[PDB]
Design a protein around this nucleic acid. Structure first.
Lengths: 197, 208, 521, 519, 93, 79, 193, 172
DNA sequence: TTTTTTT
């Protein structure tokens, strides 16, 4: 039926939600289900044409009070179910995009829709703007892990080369260890260049 | 439920953080020019912890704002609502909620509302069997520890009352079962957030 | 002695309570987890205990058979203490151990090796059915009617003769209901062929397992057993004994997608050139034979299986016939999730006992030389591969593949027969040996996944195209025979082609591809 | 003992809690009295819901599960006492009083962990009530037991009786009875066994293989013997699925005895079945509402046409053959004359058509439509096998495929492909309605036949008998002969393509589009 | 004690000869298995000479042995044409 | 295969390992050879094959191709 | 989203450890931060600076546990062992739990986390051997776990009371207990007319 | 059970048997016959989202839902025997949510009690499994196969919490 | 042992 396509889209949304919950690190999100979404939209257009025909039949007056009322109610319920399924899937994908923007953009374009990519860019701009102004003193993009360790030994996961610090330039030559405060090396760890001393 | 925003306390904490950062910068300039950086490291760690706590609280508040954007627009539209939206939120929080709701409405409208019939095009309408507006679950269970009366005197609090074995307690009721129970002071309990909200506004119990 | 045995049990309990793998006691935690899973047994690593507590290992090696029951009693006591609140008995807990030491050859095992722990490896010839060993009993003395309990440990006791409340010669008689039993399984383990001396058959030894150790393995599986070599005298040379190995533990040498794992199958389905990529990856060394590769892919996919309400069922497998095809069949045997590759020798027949066609279920079944073989003649094969069934009947629901060089061709969904640069490249690869691309396992898993996930049906457009093409072919043949069996074969091929894309319904493009492939028939 | 008395009182309380159980015991007693007067006597066996015993006392139900020997015997004694009180027991025979038949107890439904399979059976299940389901195998031939060796000392005037008990028969362990008739009475007069007064209950112990589908690959299904007594004996036969509510019982020394030096053998385990339930996995069930609907259907102007159209509705173009199949399903009337002449109650139909004409598909649909049917393929069917079957076993006779379902119809694919000698053996079934080998097996079964033209394509110029491989005598033996073959017409081809597309478009209720299954 | 090692230049000549032998088998078969047998027979000739490295003459005699096998198969049918076509191919040297 | 208990005896082709095996009268033995040539296993023969087969069980005739003179596989001849 | 899905319902063990660090603890200084009447200063905005600035060598003082551990990383600080964190006190709590299976011993809500952190760092400061304290802590944890199992067997939709239960135990039990009680309450509400 | 909850949407999309109380021409699409009018007493399984509304409204309600086999007394008896042994997932992945919806549409105290007892037993088993942590098992695999998707999500959350706690305890 | 007959 018309709601079966929306049910399939919601099933894909639940599958992606379970996958993202299973993997702590953010995987490249599944490609947007444009085919199922377009099928649901075509079904919605067909239901709208059917509702227009039912309204024309009501203008004709034949069983307009009861039969046409029930038919229009059923068609409207189908449209509402399809819209709810599409909204749920889009909201889940957009929440995944917001989580990704908080994870990386604060410090897989083919998978996203073009509107979704524009929305993710707008979300990154909003995050940068929220940090840019009031409450700029604390890096809102900074890690939410509590500062358990003031100092921690750090060495390069990758040979990125010279790196900036509060008052120093540190070479990231391969397998080069350091002893520095965790706060200064938090950004470098977010870059992935240095891991666990 | 989102707690009302304490503007005075938040602003005082922010001003203290700014002054502490300025003093730390001045000490850094003096050191670059006794000489013990251990107190400076202590102040830096304290500022980092305070900023982390403030950012976590603000992020949770923004999460609640986005979760109940529809209900917050409804409350702002509803003059009968006891709390003004600006009263509940900060100024930046109100601007963020308004702009985010507008952007989401524009996206959803251009996506589906153009094809949707105008009678069903309303995004926040309650006409659907499940209301599209999303509000905090008042009845949701939440752990709590009875803080006791904010005043030192137990007798001074009318809610505080002697219970069996000489234990002060606060009577509470769960509307669904219409059951009444007494919560001993300094004790932990699990209760619906709606009944707990009275004692929470009274500050008699702090959520775990 | 008995005080020393109680001290041994207490020392085992003390070591369990006070041994911590990393400041956390694994023995206490593992016992609690086993209790939570209701596992009335405990597994202990000899490495962890004997890494620095050598005295316990020394006593155990001195008297393993008698020592083990004391350890099990200590395990029961520790479990009762940890799990049962005091002031508010448990079934016996089996002790599992792993020697974690050098193995000894089964032939190298000797009479001195008996009565001592042994680590080894081999292939189990068979596993005997479980046999309940009476862990406890209540023996009623007949002449005086009073009972006396008996408990037995399955290591290395008989009913007492005296009545003891002595009115009878052997008056004691078991109470079966009061008696408590534990299942025990016998195992026969052949030595590994490398352990066997050259020119000699592997030696086999009788072994026993009980409680959780039973059914831990299956017959024919190579495994490494940890068990004490022992001796017993069967009721059936002089002073000769029947060797056996009581097992302390077993480690098998033989030994559903995650969030990242399922996404790979999703991408493989997302590829639009997936069918051609599978055809190309099949027989990559072979140049040309595109129709053969496409037919192999379509056979691996198989036609959609369905059952009508009246009881009529559509055939769920495609059938392919060929007339370097042996290399293609060798590749098909690996690529198929279930396959049996043979020249028809099986002396077992292809359709029969259980034949290769019956043993293969779904996937594809390949015969290296179908026409050459004449045993299990085509009369039975016709029914088997046409109705997927064979006064004996056997299921034959598996895709048919026949390599070679009528009625069988009529049953077959398709038929077929059988570059210097390709020869040069193959010679270069073979010389380097002597002096799109997708993994075979990944492709097999993807084929099984597509078969399990989607069984495409014909869309209305595909059905109309198939009907028009069939009518046109019938008219052309009448002008010049094609049958509805071949039409059903073409429909199955279209469904198989759509199965790769996992489309809800087949398409007119699939119908065109199926008709083009059938043109080669 | 005292706990057994408490269990008897508690089971009597359970019978009081569920008046239907006491009413059923009294109904068996009253039916036995009425049937003894009329002549057919119901056995003194009672089956109750396990959930019903749980409702009376969850403790009692779980206690019966944990210690069936301790609880079920006292519960059956309470049921027997209730039955003895309720029964009029008029004019009881001396042999009946000696029999003193116990009222058996069985638990039905809601078995849970007590529900079991032979592979999943455990030593903990021993000495505990359980329900085991599996394919029956190696069922023992019925052998009479002995409740008591009733005797009578000569000239004493008193009938001394010696009871005998078996550990498999009694859930509780017991010291073995001598099972030997006394040579002399306790009084000292010579003792003679009293046949008739001695009670003999039929005893059968049938192994139950685990279901082959349930059997793990690379492993043989486990089998556990289930004890059967009285009506439970011969309740099922090997190769037939059955579920038995029976207490697994540890038994034997299991190597504990001194004689077993190796001690490798485990304690013998034999389930003692309280009841045996044959399971289809069939036969249609008729109710009053469906009977009124059937009366209305017969009142319909074309009842036979309605039934035929209902038969094989998806099949296209075989509606006349389906009407003939409905006539064959009725079979006609069977009559046995006072002269002994036999009129068959079965009708044989034959239809010839090219491969993929779906005539064999209609025959398979008829095999499905019949509650019982015999399936064979002419290339794989032997008429000697259809008339009779031989097993090496002395050799044991086996019923032929036509002899099997001797009342039911037999559908045969490729009947023309079946040999003419096979057709002669089938003609013995078709006309004589009986087969003679020197063993004789009745073969009155209807023979619906799916066949193909000898050329493989029917020819109008060729006679229908010429196209059919069957002889003219065989065609006469068949009640009806049809020629339904594949053909190519434009409109009919569009219709058949739409029918196949409609079969594909049919959606199972549980599986949506794009989801595999399972007027 | 000796393990023959195929010579690279002789093996290049033998690979060209194997392509020519497959073409000649099509003309009047020859297989990559036969070329591998040529490599093995070159190892055998090196063994006959007890040389750890296979000689170019060893590879040539091995190609000759494989060509003799091909000629022996369908001898009367194809042997004369095979000999005429393989007078140069049978021995690289 | 024989009773020991049950025990197995190694085959002749298996007994000839790494040393050149011998074959003659080139058809079950031909199946062991040919299954060995395609399989690389007779159980692996692990041995070279040397054939001494009379042609068609009679004196050699020039007209018969070797495939006719001794039944075998074309892949076996190539191998 | 801003809040991780696991963090939506319960605090992480690291967050509970952060709270325990926010708690204070006594320690023995080894630096005369107090200056004689005859210098860098903490000037902490969230905690007292006077105690740190007045610390003198081997003069017992209390400070927030995080700062106490930070100083203990240096040799200057030696944390003072909690009195309840003594072998006799642990034995008393174990005996109390044994005599009162229903009533948990009055351990601090952060008893488990504090004992684990002290074993990680303050093991040297313990006059009693650390192994005995670890064994006593494990025994108390096992007793409390058995009591928690009994309480879960005796769950009720209306409410529950856990007086002396550890804060870490409460955090671990929050998801399962909350979900089960919410499901039971939903079932009861659906049953209600 | 949110409006955007995909699990709730699927549970609502599940069909349940029903018997028509009205004859409505033009509703043959539900009947799956293009032009056949609906008839009274007609029995047809309908999606829960539509079937529940039809049962609620109609005065005589437009349709009356027939009792599903998942709500059958035989399944109830199997649950009363052994809540854990039953395959609630095989019966329905959203079996508990469907039972709650059926209780809301028709208040059944005994059904709620049986469902609560089954949920409690299965939750005890799931808690044991989640407490069992690595230092896939066949027993846990079969238990999960019996467990519905919602119960499996709850078990995954609890087991992940326990595993994270154990890892943080055993690692610095 | 000797038919009987299935492999």
């Amino acid at each position: 039926m018309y709601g079966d396509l929306g049910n399939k889209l919601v099933l894909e949304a639940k599958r992606t939600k379970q996958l993202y919950a299973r993997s702590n690190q953010d995987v490249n999100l599944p490609m947007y289900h444009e085919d199922i979404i377009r099928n649901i939209l075509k079904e919605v257009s067909n239901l709208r044409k059917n509702t227009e025909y039912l309204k024309e039949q009501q203008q004709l007056g034949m069983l307009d009070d009861k039969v046409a009322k029930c038919q229009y109610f059923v068609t409207l319920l189908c449209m509402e179910r399809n819209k709810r399924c599409l909204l749920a899937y889009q909201r889940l994908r957009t929440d995944i995009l917001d989580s990704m923007a908080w994870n990386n953009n604060g410090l897989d374009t083919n998978n996203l829709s073009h509107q979704e990519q524009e929305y993710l860019k707008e979300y990154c701009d909003l995050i940068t703007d929220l940090k840019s102004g009031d409450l700029v003193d604390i890096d809102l993009s900074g890690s939410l892990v509590p500062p358990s360790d003031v100092f921690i030994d750090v060495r390069v996961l990758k040979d990125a080369g010279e790196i900036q610090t509060e008052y120093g330039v540190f070479n990231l030559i391969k397998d080069s260890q350091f002893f520095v405060r965790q706060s200064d090396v938090e950004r470098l760890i977010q870059q992935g260049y240095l891991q666990k001393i | 439920e989102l707690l009302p925003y304490p503007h005075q306390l938040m602003k005082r904490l922010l001003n203290r953080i700014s002054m502490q950062s300025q003093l730390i910068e001045n000490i850094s300039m003096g050191f670059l020019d006794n000489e013990s950086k251990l107190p400076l490291l202590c102040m830096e760690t304290e500022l980092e912890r305070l900023k982390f706590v403030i950012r976590s609280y603000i992020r949770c508040r923004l999460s609640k704002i986005d979760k109940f954007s529809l209900y917050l627009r409804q409350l702002n539209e509803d003059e009968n609502s006891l709390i003004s939206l600006t009263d509940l939120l900060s100024k930046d929080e109100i601007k963020y909620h308004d702009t985010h709701s507008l952007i989401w409405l524009k996206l959803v409208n251009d996506s589906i509302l153009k094809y949707m019939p105008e009678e069903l095009q309303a995004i926040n309408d309650t006409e659907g069997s499940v209301n599209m507006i999303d509000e905090p679950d008042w009845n949701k269970f939440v752990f709590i520890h009875v803080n006791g009366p904010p005043d030192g005197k137990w007798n001074e609090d009318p809610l505080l009352q002697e219970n069996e074995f000489g234990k002060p307690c606060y009577t509470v009721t769960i509307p669904d079962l219409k059951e009444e129970v007494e919560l001993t002071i300094g004790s932990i309990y699990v209760m619906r957030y709606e009944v707990i909200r009275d004692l929470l506004r009274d500050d008699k119990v702090a959520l775990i | 002695n008995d005080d020393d045995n109680t001290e041994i049990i207490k020392s085992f309990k003390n070591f369990i309570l006070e041994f911590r793998l990393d400041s956390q006691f694994i023995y206490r935690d593992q016992l609690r987890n086993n209790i939570l899973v209701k596992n009335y047994s405990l597994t202990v690593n000899m490495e962890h205990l004997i890494g620095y507590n050598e005295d316990i290992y020394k006593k155990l090696s001195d008297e393993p058979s008698d020592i083990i029951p004391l350890f099990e009693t200590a395990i029961t006591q520790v479990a009762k203490r940890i799990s049962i609140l005091s002031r508010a008995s448990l079934p016996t807990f089996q002790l599992i151990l792993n020697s974690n030491a050098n193995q000894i050859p089964l032939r190298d095992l000797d009479s001195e090796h008996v009565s001592k722990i042994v680590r080894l490896s081999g292939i189990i010839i068979s596993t005997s059915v479980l046999s309940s060993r009476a862990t406890y009993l209540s023996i009623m003395c007949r002449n005086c009617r009073h009972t006396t309990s008996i408990t037995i440990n399955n290591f290395n006791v008989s009913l007492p003769r005296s009545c003891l409340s002595n009115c009878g010669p052997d008056p004691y008689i078991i109470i079966h209901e009061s008696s408590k039993f534990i299942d025990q399984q016998f195992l026969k383990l052949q030595e590994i062929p490398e352990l066997v001396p050259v020119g000699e058959m592997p030696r086999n030894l009788t072994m026993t397992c009980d409680r959780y150790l039973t059914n831990k393995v299956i017959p024919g599986t190579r495994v490494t057993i940890v068990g004490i070599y022992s001796i017993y005298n069967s009721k059936n040379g002089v002073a000769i004994r029947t060797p056996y190995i009581k097992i302390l533990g077993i480690q098998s040498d033989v030994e559903m997608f995650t969030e990242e794992e399922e996404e790979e199958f999703l991408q493989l389905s997302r590829n639009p050139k997936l069918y051609e990529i599978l055809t190309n990856s099949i027989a990559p060394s072979i140049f040309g034979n595109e129709d053969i590769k496409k037919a192999i892919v379509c056979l691996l996919m198989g036609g959609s299986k369905k059952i009508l309400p009246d009881g009529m069922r559509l055939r769920g497998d495609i059938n392919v016939l060929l007339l370097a095809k042996s290399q293609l069949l060798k590749f098909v045997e690996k690529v198929s999730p279930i396959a049996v590759y043979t020249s028809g020798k099986g002396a077992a027949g292809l359709t029969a006992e259980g034949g290769a066609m019956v043993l293969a279920d779904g996937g594809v079944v390949c015969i290296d030389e179908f026409d050459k073989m004449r045993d299990e003649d085509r009369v039975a094969i016709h029914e088997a591969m046409e109705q997927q069934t064979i006064t004996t009947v056997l299921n034959s629901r598996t895709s048919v593949l026949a390599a070679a060089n009528t009625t069988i061709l009529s049953r077959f969904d398709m038929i077929f027969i059988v570059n210097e640069e390709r020869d040069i490249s193959i010679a270069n690869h073979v010389i380097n040996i002597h002096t799109s691309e997708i993994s075979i396992e990944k492709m097999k898993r993807y084929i099984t996944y597509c078969r399990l996930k989607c069984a495409p049906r014909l869309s209305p457009q595909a059905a109309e195209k198939l009907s028009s093409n069939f009518v046109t072919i019938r008219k052309q043949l009448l002008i010049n025979p094609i049958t509805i069996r071949q039409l059903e074969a073409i429909i199955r091929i279209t469904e198989s082609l759509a199965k790769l894309e996992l489309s809800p319904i087949a398409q007119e493009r699939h119908v065109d591809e199926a008709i083009r492939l059938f043109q080669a028939s | 003992d005292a706990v057994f008395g408490d269990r008897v009182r508690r089971f009597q309380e359970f019978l009081d809690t569920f008046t239907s159980y006491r009413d059923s015991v009294r109904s068996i007693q009253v039916y036995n009295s009425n049937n003894a007067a009329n002549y057919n006597i119901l056995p003194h066996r009672i089956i109750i819901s396990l959930d019903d015993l749980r409702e009376f006392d969850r403790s009692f139900w779980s206690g019966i599960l944990v210690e069936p020997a301790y609880f079920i015997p006292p519960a059956e004694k309470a049921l027997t006492d209730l039955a003895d009180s309720m029964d009029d027991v008029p004019h009881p025979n001396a042999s009946a009083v000696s029999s003193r038949h116990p009222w058996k107890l069985s638990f039905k439904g809601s078995f849970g962990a007590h529900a079991l399979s032979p592979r999943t059976l455990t030593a903990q299940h021993l000495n505990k009530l359980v329900s085991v389901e599996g394919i029956v195998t190696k069922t023992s031939l019925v052998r009479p037991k002995l409740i008591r060796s009733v005797h009578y000392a000569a000239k004493t005037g008193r009938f001394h009786y010696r009871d005998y008990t078996d550990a498999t028969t009694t859930l509780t362990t017991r010291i073995p009875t001598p099972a030997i008739y006394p040579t002399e009475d306790t009084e000292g007069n010579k003792l003679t066994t009293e046949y008739g007064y001695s009670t003999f209950i039929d005893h059968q112990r049938i192994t139950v293989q685990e279901m082959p589908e349930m059997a793990p690959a690379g492993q043989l299904p486990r089998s556990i013997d289930v004890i059967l007594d009285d009506d439970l004996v011969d309740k099922t036969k090997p190769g037939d699925r059955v579920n038995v509510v029976g207490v697994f019982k540890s038994l034997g020394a299991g190597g504990m005895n001194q004689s077993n030096s190796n001690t490798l053998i485990g304690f013998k385990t034999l389930i003692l079945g309280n009841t045996v339930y044959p399971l289809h996995a069939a036969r249609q069930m008729l109710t009053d509402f469906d009977i009124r609907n059937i009366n209305k259907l017969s009142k319909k102007k074309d009842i036979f046409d309605i039934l035929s159209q209902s038969l094989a509705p998806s099949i296209y173009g075989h509606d006349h053959i389906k009407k003939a199949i409905l006539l064959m399903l009725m079979g006609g009337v069977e009559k046995n004359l006072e002269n002994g002449s036999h009129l068959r109650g079965d009708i044989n139909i034959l239809m010839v058509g090219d491969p993929s004409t779906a005539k064999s598909q209609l025959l398979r649909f008829v095999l499905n439509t019949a509650s019982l049917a015999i399936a064979t393929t002419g290339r794989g069917s032997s008429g000697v096998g259809l008339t009779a079957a031989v097993t090496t076993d002395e050799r044991r006779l086996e019923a032929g495929a036509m002899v099997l379902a001797d009342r039911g119809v037999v559908c045969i694919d490729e009947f023309d492909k079946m040999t003419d000698v096979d057709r002669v053996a089938i003609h013995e079934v078709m006309e004589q309605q009986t087969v003679t080998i020197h063993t004789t097996l009745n073969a009155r079964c209807s023979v619906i036949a799916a066949a193909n033209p000898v050329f493989g394509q029917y020819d109008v110029n060729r006679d229908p008998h010429q196209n059919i491989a069957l002889p003219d005598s065989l065609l006469s033996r068949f009640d009806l002969l049809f020629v339904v073959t594949d053909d190519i017409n434009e409109i009919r081809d569009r219709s058949i393509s739409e029918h196949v597309l409609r079969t594909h478009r049919y959606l199972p209720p549980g599986y949506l589009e794009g989801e595999p299954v399972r007027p | 004690k000796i393990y023959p090692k195929l010579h690279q230049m002789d093996m290049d000549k033998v690979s060209r000869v194997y392509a020519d032998l497959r073409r000649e088998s099509i003309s009047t078969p020859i297989t990559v298995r036969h070329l591998e047998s040529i490599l093995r027979i070159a190892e055998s000739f090196a063994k006959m000479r007890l040389s750890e490295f296979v000689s170019s003459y060893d590879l040539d005699r091995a190609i000759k042995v494989v060509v003799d096998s091909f000629v022996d198969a369908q001898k009367v049918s194809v042997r004369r044409q095979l000999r005429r076509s393989f007078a140069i191919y049978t021995l690289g040297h | 295969v024989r009773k020991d208990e049950w025990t197995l005896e190694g085959g002749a082709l298996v007994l000839a390992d790494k040393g050149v095996c011998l074959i003659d009268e080139f058809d079950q033995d031909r199946t062991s050879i040919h299954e060995a040539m395609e399989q690389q296993s007779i159980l692996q023969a692990r041995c070279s094959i040397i054939a001494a087969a009379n042609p068609n069980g009679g004196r050699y005739n020039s007209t018969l191709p070797l495939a006719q003179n001794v039944s075998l596989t074309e892949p076996i001849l190539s191998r | 989203m801003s809040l991780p899905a696991h963090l939506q319902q319960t605090f992480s063990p690291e967050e509970i450890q952060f709270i325990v660090e926010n708690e204070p603890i006594k320690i023995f200084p080894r630096i005369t931060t107090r200056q004689k009447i005859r210098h860098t200063r903490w000037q902490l905005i969230t905690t007292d600076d006077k105690a740190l600035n007045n610390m003198v060598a081997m003069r017992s003082t209390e400070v927030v546990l995080w700062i106490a551990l930070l100083l203990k990383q240096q040799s200057k600080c030696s944390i003072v062992a909690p009195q309840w964190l003594t072998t006799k006190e642990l034995d008393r709590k174990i005996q109390y739990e044994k005599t009162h299976p229903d009533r948990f011993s009055e351990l601090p809500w952060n008893w488990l986390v504090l004992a684990r952190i002290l074993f990680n760092k303050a093991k040297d400061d313990f006059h009693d051997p650390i192994h005995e304290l670890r064994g006593k802590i494990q025994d108390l944890r096992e007793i409390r776990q058995i009591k928690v199992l009994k309480g879960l067997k005796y769950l009720n939709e209306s409410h529950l009371q856990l007086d002396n239960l550890s804060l870490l135990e409460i955090n671990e039990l929050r998801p399962f207990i909350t979900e089960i009680m919410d499901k039971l309450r939903e079932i009861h509400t659906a049953s209600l007319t | 059970m949110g409006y955007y909850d995909i699990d709730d949407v699927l549970a609502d999309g599940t069909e349940f048997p029903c018997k028509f109380q009205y004859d409505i021409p033009g509703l043959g699409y539900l009947e799956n016959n293009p032009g056949r009018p609906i008839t009274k007493n007609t029995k047809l399984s309908l999606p829960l989202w539509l079937a529940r509304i039809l049962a609620i409204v109609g005065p005589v309600p437009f349709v009356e839902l027939l009792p599903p086999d998942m709500f059958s007394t035989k399944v109830m008896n199997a649950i009363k025997t052994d809540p854990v042994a039953l395959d609630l997932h095989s019966i329905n992945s959203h079996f508990f949510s469907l039972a709650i919806k059926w209780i809301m549409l028709f208040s059944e105290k005994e059904l709620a009690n049986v469902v609560s007892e089954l949920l409690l037993q299965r939750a005890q088993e799931l808690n044991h499994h989640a407490s069992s942590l690595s230092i896939t098992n066949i027993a846990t695999s079969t238990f999960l196969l019996k467990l519905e998707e919602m119960e499996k999500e709850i078990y995954k959350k609890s087991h992940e919490s326990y595993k994270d706690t154990k890892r943080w305890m055993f690692k610095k």
